[PDB]
Design a protein around this ligand. Sequence first.
Ligand SMILES: CN1CCN(C(=O)Nc2ccc(F)cc2)CC1
Length: 435
Amino acid sequence: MLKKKQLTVLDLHPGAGKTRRVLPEIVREAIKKRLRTVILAPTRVVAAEMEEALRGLPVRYMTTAVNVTHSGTEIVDLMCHATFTSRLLQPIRVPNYNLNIMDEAHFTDPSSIAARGYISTRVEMGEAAAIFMTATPPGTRDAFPDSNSPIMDTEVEVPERAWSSGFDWVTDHSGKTVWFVPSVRNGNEIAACLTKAGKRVIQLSRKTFETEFQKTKNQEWDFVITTDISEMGANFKADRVIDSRRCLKPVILDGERVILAGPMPVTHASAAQRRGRIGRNPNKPGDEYMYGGGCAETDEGHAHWLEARMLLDNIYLQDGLIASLYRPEADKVAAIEGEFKLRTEQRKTFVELMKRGDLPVWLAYQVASAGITYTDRRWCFDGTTNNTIMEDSVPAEVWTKYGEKRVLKPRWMDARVCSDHAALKSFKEFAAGKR
Ligand SMILES: CN1CCN(C(=O)Nc2ccc(F)cc2)CC1
């Protein structure tokens, strides 16, 4: 596994012990062989669970999710997938790790795809070894993998709106349910319906994940309503998963705007990870998995793989060479390697728009490639009338940094900046020059 030029896919079933049993064994062996090693966690919650599994081993935690006093002699670093890609993009020196371990390697956010691309390229070059840990590698077609204990799988119509009748099985249950919804707005409606029926509901999404996930441990709950972020190693003490089997798909139209298409079917890998939240206790057989649709290969033409190419085109590898996507996921995007490579100043703007600006990769690239500087927000107001962002059925308005009230009408429209109330609030602050 640890030899140069080797990439191993550790694909044991969900709950088989990849993170808590296998990972410490690999790390102990890497330390014995003096391999400079990186361990990539998908989220801060996983980074904290990894410190518990690796306690006693000399690991440098490059995350504020863990409060540890680092000796300075560690040769094993642990950080999130996003932090690894961010440090590669920034002028900072990232060590040339001999062994690269990615946990929850199925993560399809642009920074995780780019991290796989870079690492797999280094392995192909003969410079490093890598281990990708996931039950569902790219292209898997099995939505029903093995589990620690038998699961009751039932195809059933699942509500995606508030309901008054016809779904008694949903509320008649007396255990704990994790329910996967296609979007934050859809979860808000279902959570309100369940709360009105007397249930205790916790909601999780990317922006609220670390904070709200703690509530699943600190208080009693009946339902967790979550987007796809809970496919990335989130553990619950639940006995049922309700799975809409739907997700939103960012799609670039005519190379000039991004829409959130769908809801549409999830991939088999997503379905297997959603189901994989339950059936984890060998002493509790009969956990239920209720699913409301089929799977499809909705990662084909999905914006995240084009965004991963934008990030890889702007990471130094060697001279003018550019890292390729990891081979099993390299056909998801029609893209030319190097087409998004930016000159030094525009690249710095692109990075700052993602890091400080908190903009989606595609949108950050359109602004930087137009030669616009980070603090110049005129583009948030000079788009066509059809790019007007709406707030409760009327044009959204902001006071510009000049003190003028203006309608929010970006030159490039990316639906992700206004997909929910929190996203629109953050984009309004950006349009106003507040960060
Ligand atoms: C609304 N989102 C929040 C998270 N986000 C991000 O994770 N970007 C990023 C891109 C590249 C990279 F390498 C690391 C992070 C910015 C936009």
